[PDB]
Each structure stands twice: as C-alpha cells, then as structure tokens.
C-alpha cells in the first residue's frame, strides 16, 4: 500500500552502522563493477543499493580512464545492501550517467539520465516500464540527486539541474506520480547553486540538502510541499558542511564564498533549529567523515556544536554522502527514521591507478548507545591492472 | 615395443630394506597393471604384488602383506617395489612385468583392485 | 491470464533507451557467454533477453572459430534485461542454433532448432516441457525468426524458412497454442525471400518484417490473422532498410535487386501508410544504427522521410535488430507499445580476433521528448585470448 | 499433491533433445564443479540436474587425481537443467559419493551415501531434513542407482547393492515414504548382478534396468509393486546394451558371459515385448550413444531391430546414461512420459589430463518427427591445469 | 508462527552427516570469502550458514595478515547450508567481528558487534532492521556466542562477555523480543569464565555450554528460564571437553586448572546426567574431532564413557564447534532435535600461509544407524598467493 509519509523525523542521538560492502577489496579478485555515485533507497519490504556502473569490472583493462563521469556505457543498477556490486547479483535499472531512485510504496521509480551533454534526456521508469521522459532545457549537462528521491502520499519528488557547474544554473522541482511527471517548478534562486540534492520526506513535506559547486562552502537547501510551493536558504551554521570549505568560523544564512568553489555531495537532517551535519574531516581533500549535531546550526551562524561522532578516519579516503529514510511502513515505528550512506572513493585522481571506483558504508540513526570509529574502504592500491 | 629397465644389483644385511625401480621405457605405463615377481635361485616364480597407477590401487600376496610396498610415478613412468625386514630367504632375482592388455574401466574402484591377463 | 492482443500499436514519436548490457566489455574479465542473435521478449510481469550461446565463455580458448552459426553446442538461454549473459544468471531454454520465444500470457513458449542441416528439428517447449516438434521439410537448413514470436488471444505465431539462402526457398506460418502446432500454411510467394522475421501483434493480427537474403535490399513483409490468411509484399519506401543496400533512391513494392544479395535481420513498424524503419547507417558494412519515420513509406516509393533518430554512430559496429512489444497487460496502457533491440556484433570477420560475439541495446517507443546519440558496444579489441 | 503414478508409459517413436549444459567447455574459464554421475529428476513443477561433486573446480589443482569415485569431499548437489554445475547456482543436498533422488510430489527425497568402505551409511533426507539412515549390511562398498528413484502413490522406491563388484553381491529393494524406509526385501537372485539401476514407475509398478558388472553384457532387470513382490530377469535381446559387450548376436534371457565383465550404467524402456535400448556405439570403449527400438527385444533373443536413432557420434566420448520420467502431474498428459540423460565423461583414464569430469545431454520421448545427430561434450583437452 | 520451544531434546544415539561446503578447496579457484567463526541456524522453513567474513577473498592479496579477529572490514553474512561462502550467493546481515543469530519463528534476529575494543557496540537487527543496540560496559573487547542464539515462545536469548580473556570477566544474559532487549542479568559467577557459548533451547528453558579461556580445561555452563533466573556450573566429566586440556582423568564440577589456559569454542548436549561431548582428538593442537557419550558425565567426575564416534581424523585440522537445533516447527517431530557444526581452520598460525580461513561440516542427531569417519577440510596448502 502507498507510503503515507506524514510522520516527522525520529529524533536521534547517534548513528549505528548498517552496512559495509567491501567492494573494492573484494574487487581485487572477484568480478565487481567499477562504480561511482552509489546510494541506498528502501521499499516497505527491503533496502537496496543503487549505483552508476561504468560498464566494466575492476582489475580489467576496460576500467582504464574511468574518471570521466559520462559515457554511453554507464548504467544504473541495484543490488541488496552490504553486497558487492557484481554482474551476478545486480539488477539492471536504466542506462544513465546520472540517476535517482525511490519507492512510492508499490513500485520502484528510477530516473536515468543519458545522452549528449547538450541534449541529455532523463528516462523515468515505474516498475521498470518507461513511463515518462524529460529533456535538458538549458542544453548544459542535465543532472539529478545521485541519491534517493522522496515519496509522500503516493507522489515522489526530485531535483534536477541544467546549466553551468561553475556559475548560475537552472534548478527544478518535480512531482512524479507512478513515474509520470505531473508538476514542475523552476526555483527562483538567484546567486544560489544546487547540485546532487539529498532529499528526505518530513511530515508530509520534503527538505533537500544540496551542494553549492559555484560559490558555496555551506550547503544550500530547499523545502517544498506537494503543491511544490518552496522555500530556499543555506545552512547558517558556522560548522561548514561542504568540501572544500574554510575552517570553522562565523557562518552565514547565505552562500559562504570562502572556498566556495566546487564541492562534494552531502546531506543534513534538520530538527527544528538544529541540524545533523555529515561532512569530511579534512578541509581540502575528500578524507575522513564525521557526524556533528549542532543544536542551533540550522538558523544560527556560530561555530559551536555539542556532539561529534567519528565515521571515517581523517587519513582515509571518503567521498559522496547522502540521506536515506526508513518509513514506518518498513520499520513499524511511529516516525520516519533517518539514515545515511558514505561513498569511499578509491583511485584517481588522488591515487596512482588507471581507474576510479568506490565502496559504501551506511549508518542508521538510533536513540541508544553508539560509538565512533573508522570504517574505511580498506583496499590496497594500486591493483594488478595498474602496473 | 615396450622395454622395462630395472635398477642394478643390491646386497643387504638382514633386517634392512631394499627398493627396486622399474622404468617403463615405452608408451603403456599409465593404464597398465605392473606386477613384481621374484625367483629364488633354482626355484619357482613367486608373485609379490601388483599396481595399477591410473587407479592408484595395489594388491599384495598374503605372504608379503606388511613388509612389501609397491608405488608408481606417473610422470617418469616408473614403478617401485620396497621390501622391508629382509631375511636371508629373500635372496632372489626380482622381476617387474607389465600386463598384456589395458586395464578395464572401473567406476567403483576397490582399494585392492587388480587385473591379470598375462605378463 | 491470457494476452488478449486486440489493441492497436501505440503511435510513437521517438525512442527512449530501455537497456544496455555491456556484455563484451564485462566479458573481458567476468564469465560471460559467447553469444549471437539476441532478442528481448516480455511476459505480463517481466521482460527477458534470449540469446543463442556457443557453449563457451569470452576470453577462453573454446571461443575459437565461433563464427560458425551452427554447432551441437549452441543453446538457447535467457537472462533478465540489461544483465550480462553469464552462466551464473542465465536460465536454460533449449538446445538450438536457431530459436524464437514468446509468452502467451501464462507460460514461456520456446522454439529450439538443432540437428543436422538436412534433418533439422525444431523442439517446441511450453513451460520448459516439450510439447511439439517439427522437422525440416526441404532438408536445407531450417531456421526461424531469431526474435520474439507474436501471441494473440492465447495463440502464438511464428515464421520458419526451409531451403536455400541464396535462392527461392519455402516459408511457412505456424499457429501454436500451448506449445502445440495447431495450424500451418506454406506461403505462395514466388520471387520472394523470407528470413529471420520480426513479428509483432497489431489489433488481433500479426505483421512480420523480414530479411530478403536472395535478391532484396528492401524488406519483405507478411501479415496474417488467426486463421492464417496472409498478405505478402515488400516495404515500398525508397529508404531501403536492409544491409547491404543501394543509396536512397526510388523504391519498389517488390524486391529491389540492386545490392539485393545477402542482408541483415531487421524490423519495421507500420502505421497506416507510414513506417518506422530501423536500419544500419552504412550501406556496405554492419556499422551504425538509426530510426527513420517515413510517413508514406509503407505504400509509397519515394525516398523522402520526415524524422531520423540516431542510435549507433556510423563508425561503430552494429548487427541484428528486431522488434519486441509490451502489451497493455504488462504496461497498463490501452495499446500495445512497440520496442526494439539492437545487436552489436564484435570480432570476426571484421576484427582481428578468434571469436565473434555480441552485446545488446534496446529502446522503447514513447510519445514524449527523446534524443539521438551513439550507444555502442565499447569493448576494446582484441582481447587477451587473441594474442 | 501426491504423485499418483498409475499411468502407463506413453508410447514413443523417437527422441527430441531436451537439454545440454556444456559444462566442461564452460569449465575451462568459469567456476565449475568437477562432477561425475549426474542425473535428472523432476517434480510436478520443475526438473533438476543432480550430480556428485568432487569438492573442487575445473582447471584447479584440487581436481588432481579425481578419478577415485569415493572421498570425504564428494557431495550430492543439484542445479536447474541445462545449467552449468557451478557453486553459484548449485543447491546442496547431501554429502555423498553415491546418491539417488526423486520427488514424491510434495518434497525432494535425496539419498546420500558416505563413510568408509566397510561402514558406509546412506543418509535419507526429505525436504533437506534427515529422516532415515541405512548402514551397509555386507561391509563392501554400499552403492545405489546414481539416477532418479521412482515414486508411486506417495511411496518412492530405490535399489542398493552391497558386496563385490566382480562377483555375487547382495541387492535390496526399498520402499521409502516421506524419507522413512518402511519396507525392504533382499533379492533372491543367485548368479545375477545388479548395480546402478535406472528405475522408472509404470502404471503403479516399477521396473529397474541395471548394470551387470560381474558376468553380464546384457542388462539385468527387476520389476516390483508397492508390496515389493518382485520379478527378475535379463533383457533377452541380441542387441546387447552393456559396455563392453560382444557384437550383436544371439542373446539370452540370462546373463551373457561373453564380455560380461565390468560394464556401464544404462537404461531401457519396456513396451510389452519390445524395448527401447540406449547404449554406446563402440563395443570396447565408452564412445558414442544411440537409441535402438527392438519390437520383440524384451522377450526375444534375436539381434533384429527396426529403429535406430543416433545421439553421440561413435568417435566422441560418452558415459553413464539413465532414465527419468515426466509425470502427468507435470506435463498435463494422460500418461507418464519417458526421458533419458547421457553423461559425457572427459579426461582420465582415456585422456591425458590430471582430472575426470563430465557434462550432460538429455532427451525426451515424443510421438512426432525427430532426427539423429551428434551432441558431444566438445571440450578441447588437455586444459591449462594439465600442462 | 512463533517457535514454541516447549519440547525436550530428542534422545540421540549417533550423528549423521548433514552438510559439507568444501569452501577452501573451492576457494583455490572460485571467488570465496575468507571466513572464520561460522555457524548454522535454522528457521521453521530453512537452515542457513552464518559466518564472519574478512572483507576479502581467498587467493587474493587482501587475505594477507587475516589472523587478526577484529577489523573494520569484517561483516556477518549468511548463505544456504553446504554452499560456499561466495559474494555471489551470500546475504549481508551486519558489520561485525563477533556475531550471533537465530530465528524466533517469524524473522531473522542478527547481532553484530563492531567498533573499537574499548567502545564496542552490538547492533541488533530484526528482519534486517536495526531494532536495538548495546554498548560495552567494561571497555574490554565485547564478544558473543559466535553460534546461534536460542528462541523460546517468541523470546530469544544470548550470552555476551565483557572484560579480560585471561582473567575474571563480566558475563550477561539477554532476553531479546523482536530484536529489542527486554531484560538482562549479569551473572554472579566468581572464578568462572564464559566465552563463545553454545546455547540451545530445551523444554522452555535454555542451557549454554561455553568456553573457559582463563583457567578451565572443562567446559562451563549456564542454564536459565524466560525470567533469566539462572544456574551455573562446570561439566563434571573426566572426559575433558576443551582444547587444550589434560589427558582424561578425574574431573571436577568446578574449573579444572590443569591446561586451564586458553581454549576453543565448543558445545555439549545434556541428557539427564548424561552428556554428548564434542571435542578435538588432540590434547594440544586443534586437530581432529569426535563425539563422546558419557551417560553420567554431566554430574559425575570419572573418565569412563560408553560411546565414541569419529568425526575428523586426529591428523587433520579442526577448530570451532557449536550446537544448532531443528525445532518441531521445522522437522514435524515431537521434540527439538540437536545438531552441531565443526569449523575446519586452515592456514595461520599452524600452516605456512599469509591467511587464515575455514570450512564447515555439520551433523544432526538421529536414533538410527550411523558411522564414524573423517570429513576433513581437504585443501592443499599453501595456495598460489602464499608463494
Ligand atoms: C597430482 O597427483 C599426482 C599423484 O597421483 C602427483 O604425482 C607425483 O608427481 C611427483 C612429481 O611431480 C612425483 O615425484 C617424483 O618422485 C621421484 C622419486 O620417485 C623424484 O625423483 C622426482 O624428483 C619427483 O620428486 C611423484 O612420484 C608422483 N606420485 C605419483 C603417485 O605418481 C602430481 O605431482 C600431482 N600434480 C599436481 C599438479 O598436483
Ligand atoms: C583456432 O582455430 C584455428 C583453426 O580455425 C587454428 O588454426 C590453425 O593454426 C595452426 C597453428 O596454430 C596451423 O598449423 C600450422 O600448419 C602448418 C602446415 O600447414 C605448419 O607448418 C605449422 O607449423 C602449423 O602447425 C593450422 O594450419 C591452422 N588451421 C587452420 C584451419 O587455419 C588455431 O590454431 C586455433 N587457435 C587456438 C588458440 O585454439
Ligand atoms: Ca563548494
Ligand atoms: Ca551552534
Ligand atoms: Ca539482401
Ligand atoms: Ca516518403
Ligand atoms: Ca558387464
Ligand atoms: Ca528383435
Ligand atoms: Ca581453557
Ligand atoms: Ca562417566
């Protein structure tokens, strides 16, 4: 039955580890897809790990030059959580170099973006059947969340961006129902920049935490209801969430231009005026990951926080991070619980290999005892194909 | 044709052991039964044991059970016979002799399986 | 429940990409069948990719000399769409070096042709149970669609050809019900040649678009109803659909002899007097692929067309193409939607390898925004086994 | 619901090919079990391929010396038909170096024999739950059909042999119900020898065709009813069915001593006084396979037959063969249809390798057009592990 | 429906072999997890093999130094019995270097322990959803059964240990209901030491047989009811069950200090004052395994026993062993039948390799004929990665 989604976020006091696939380590021997931009999304019965393959396997010559994010060979596929993304256990979803997926409660909705940079087309599938398409309106690379979309009452929502990555672009909110786009609104957000949003439903509405790749070291956000009336803003906290960023300092409810140039996909969970912030430990590279609870970070500009939980050691590689929720329909609770995943990027550009891939770890929020630690990728690079 | 080349002569004190080699300088070796027969001077032929290298099975006469060991080397096409606890009555000429026909196909291999058409 | 099939073809205005398996690329490392002649067919619940294996894996010595289309080792197998045809995810269907398969709505029907060239026998299976056989009646290699058959009201139809590939042969229509051949008619089509037909149901009837390997650069077609009363003819369009062919010129409603010698398996969708034509971009070799909408091409002989959508670049390898439909029982629509797949042949005879195999792409027709692009195989040849 | 089994054998006039797994060919690259003694058995829903693994994979050093039929590492496992026996698609049944399995209509019954040669114990499982055991009663290797057992009315029957393989042994019939041995009878058959029987139900009774390894070149048989009252005999036909055997000559209703020494597992289908005989083409080695219809071969001693259908060419390796039936519960017919499988042994002792394994082909009887051909293993030996 | 668990243990007179996966042997070629601490647990429908991976595959460089029991890469995963623990057939359960799992009758309960040594946290999952957590209360490595937990009437119980492995530690009993910890009691057991308990339900109560790593060569035990009222003690039999141990001598109902230093995970089944003891054959190393029936061993101190059944030869490697039961809901019997598994550790420290892994064998108790034999690992070490 449909996912109601009228519950508020469960309030959380930590993070318990949920899954770790150990892909790249197992990829040194097994047959493992070269992947990047993975994300988790759950149905009222199970959770799956979606990812963008490169049409090639690790330790294979076809994994050469797989830095390039866009090729006609990339495909969106999914496998059970904690499992390695192998051709023998992965289900095909769509041909895409930019993707998003969520479950309205009755069927998997997948959004796959492929085509040329000037004419990219997003293919929408509901139960694997093509239900709708949408073509780039700015003719500059069309891209989407790279994380799960948010479904409420039977309608699922997502964010897409068309235009420059280093300047003012065009951003849209969509309201899909059974794979058919029923409403869309372009956001009137001058001087804002939205990319790779992490959207989660919260008490019949949706709030997306996104990445400002143009002039922002804090994260922009947009919240909206089913009618797509929206409000925009930036996380005011002096605990900056993007990477790169400056050191913790006085924040701003607008874009912070210092180290405001290109960033990393991330997420945040808003609790009133507070915010759970997931970010890298390093300020320059994509190293380490941690969760920080700022009780006034959503509306306040100071750098004070009360809780910090280690996720990945500051010396070890991290990458994209995104939110995913577990609805009461799945958990039996009375509130929609938040969780998140972390991508562990290995190889190029930072390492001496011919390839780039990533593994994943995931955590779910609980109101009980937790602990901080380091759950890194763990692969020993370079691989045999790199010699 | 096939030629079986044995090791040179041997002299042993009692209680010691001896090992004689049998190099099949030909084709047959793998699927063929090899027997070891000894003959005391001026006496009759006495069969000690046999081996089928492809099946890894051996069959020993009841007189030599416990102190005879017949092994094979599929790589070098060589057979071996090792007799321990040597007594003066073991003084004899020791022959190794291949069988005449290829071993039959045995799906249920008995650990002591052996066949004999003629050496 | 049975597949009614009384709906007309949905009218289409483009093609959205449906799947891409990236077989040969993943075959460089993983365990992947050496395949050829793949095709997609759908049930009211799922879609599958059928293919004829060679009893061997890519990058293995047993893939030597696998040009020969007929051997006792070739088997018809199937795996989910967009998935790599591996022995670890492929279901066995039948021993065949020529096959066809379709779903009447309650069970998979598979047709496998094996045996000697003079005595070939087609084994018919319904739910994997042998239900009927049919033997070569002209003792010259017996062959069939190599694409999905067409089911209407519970009865499935196919085409088989017996006789010479470079001359006049014998062609028969069959009407299978639960795997049992219930009626057959030999077509009286002198000077016609039918091979590897692409049949789709259209409002209680079936129209097959086929390949004229004897003297034809346009495609022959045959349409029939449940009683197997049949029409024959050739696509009149001056936009020639076979490969090789001549340049676009004045067409003919009969076989066009110029470059009429051996061709390639193809398809077409008739809409009134118009036709959607899928064909290679090159005139001599099997390179590139494109979809062309000729609004009067089914009955008119001019070379004018109004719409063309790129599928595979003119420089990259293409191969067999075939139609497959998605019935309202599966999609929930009110008309049977058309789709198609493209085989991307790699290796011999055009490339310096010891093997020949193929990957697949597929597209489904939508009445919405689409884009043309190039989705090629992408494998870097030769492979390590070829040195 | 239970499998009634009161239908007579369907009368047949040929054999249509059912499956071919191409194991050893795919085993050169993929991860494939080193197997031997495979057999097919069907439920009222599906058919499966059971086999005895060697706890090792092809082209691996652990496949060394795998001639020896008995080791603590051999296990009975099963996979879908026509599929390769890989650890990624094989279901575990029991630890066994001699096995038998059949489906009473509600649950898989499996019989696994392991242990020492003097104390072998057959483990009986019903739905994977150990339901009974039986210990060797003559302390000389305990062995069973290596093909499917036969179920009637809810009771399944098998044959086991305890004692010498080159002389008089002890033979017992069992009547298992839901995995529990409820009745057993030792056969009073002096000068008879029974090994590796191929039993099939025939209209509420069972007739087993077996292998005389001691002094028999024709095949011994035993038929019995639910109360295990039995009749014994040998196939009288002068078309000898064992391998080795003499040339076709005057047969005998008793054991034929000429070339009566060790044989090969086989099968036969009795139709009144006629018999369908499956046997190798060669008289000395395990080469080729063919089906021969002798209309009076069950009770007559002449060498005349009326129908012969080629299965495997006389020059190519063959091996064990066994019967398996498809009940009306599965096929919807009004009679229990007969089928058979053929093991294609590759490697030792006949070939220059360090291993022995086998693939499988299978055929089902139909009353329609068929053809003879050669469907051999096809693997190019030696493999890379043998250098 | 819930697992009642009010039946007593079925009385047994032997052990019939249930499964053997041949992992390490197949790991030489196939893609197989480097595992350790495997155990079997059954639902009312199936049985599964849980295990702690090392995030690496056999014969891969990432299997180097995999002696260390604790790393951020170890994960609790499961696959069907007798199947090889491959990433292509294994289901993910939780991130853990110490685990326990059982089925209450409606959903799999899994307990995964990860984190630092001073702050380890056990993540509890019910149907893969995180339902509870519990943190280390003594800040010295938190560990659990490494075998199945025991469920009665819908409540599942387990044992956890916190503190020194070479001295007095803290031991707690838990009562989980639908993955939620509802009651816990710390055991008042001075001079006792509990580690890696093998718990089985027995007529509405639970009795765990454990490992005394501090000063015990006999096995400690603790039994409790649903209210967690408990009784403690040691197996009094002079047939010592731990490894290392002294020779069989006069036993004690307290800890036997002679060879009382570190031991091996084991199990035992109490029947009145009799006990079925599973132990290694060697007194010093982990070699061989056997089952011993001592009719008065539970309360008596003599070394006399009446039955002994060989499991693994004294010369071949053995390792962890644990109990697992099959409830009447699964077997249809009127009593809860006992079974057990044996881990076969290969590699370090005893062998010249860079890795440590294990395979498994399992036996189930039957009141029928059985036999003793040796079912060892069988892998030929070292592997190619060790050169
Ligand atoms: C597979 O198993 C067979 C056994 O069935 C192994 O054969 C053995 O091969 C070795 C050489 O590889 C033989 O050893 C030799 O011994 C002679 C002395 O007799 C010595 O002079 C040589 O230098 C060499 O060490 C051994 O006798 C032979 N054993 C048998 C029973 O034939 C084979 O090596 C195994 N191959 C693999 C790849 O595992
Ligand atoms: C794949 O199959 C082809 C056959 O289609 C194999 O080709 C054959 O290659 C061998 C050499 O590798 C050729 O043999 C040569 O014969 C000449 C005499 O004519 C002799 O002087 C040379 O020393 C050599 O022995 C053989 O003629 C050729 N056959 C054909 C029909 O082309 C090829 O070897 C196979 N490759 C693999 C990897 O399986
Ligand atoms: Ca930025
Ligand atoms: Ca603050
Ligand atoms: Ca042509
Ligand atoms: Ca036109
Ligand atoms: Ca015989
Ligand atoms: Ca006759
Ligand atoms: Ca101890
Ligand atoms: Ca005692």
Numbering used by the authors:
A (entry chain D), C (entry chain B), D (entry chain A), E (entry chain C): 83 to 469
B (entry chain H): 1 to 119
Reported in the publication:
NA is an important glycoprotein on the influenza virus surface, which is known as the target of licensed small-molecule inhibitors (oseltamivir, zanamivir, peramivir, and laninamivir). Here, we investigate a monoclonal antibody, Z2B3, isolated from an H7N9-infected patient, that exhibited cross-reactivity to both N9 (group 2) and a broad range of seasonal and avian N1 (group 1) proteins but lost activity to the N1 with the substitution K432E. The NA-Z2B3 complex structures indicated that Z2B3 binds within the conserved active site of the neuraminidase (NA) protein.
A gel filtration survival assay indicated that Z2B3 Fab can bind to both 18N1 and AH-N9 neuraminidases but could not bind to N1 from A/Serbia/NS-601/2014 H1N1 virus containing the K432E substitution (Serbia N1). The loss of activity of Z2B3 on seasonal N1 from viruses isolated after 2013 was localized to an antigenic drift mutation, K432E, at a site previously conserved in seasonal H1N1 viruses. We hypothesized that the negatively charged E432 in the newly evolved Serbia N1 may hamper the antibody binding because of the electrostatic repulsion. To test this hypothesis, we modified the antibody Z2B3 with D102R in the heavy chain and then purified the mutant antibody (Z2B3-D102R) in the baculoviral expression system. A gel filtration assay indicated that it could bind to Serbia N1, and the binding affinity measured by SPR was 401 nM, which was increased 100-fold compared with the wild-type Z2B3. The complex structure of Serbia N1 and Z2B3-D102R further demonstrated that a salt bridge was formed between the E432 of Serbia N1 and R102 of Z2B3-D102R as expected. In the prophylactic groups, mice treated with 5 mg/kg or 10 mg/kg of Z2B3-D102R showed 100% protection, while mice treated with the same dose of Z2B3 displayed no protection. In the therapeutic groups, mice treated with 10 mg/kg or 20 mg/kg of Z2B3-D102R showed 80% and 100% survival, respectively, while neither counterpart doses of Z2B3 provided any protection. These results indicate that D102R substitution could restore the protection by Z2B3 against A/Serbia/NS-601/2014 virus, which was in agreement with the restored inhibition of NA enzymatic activity and viral replication in vitro.
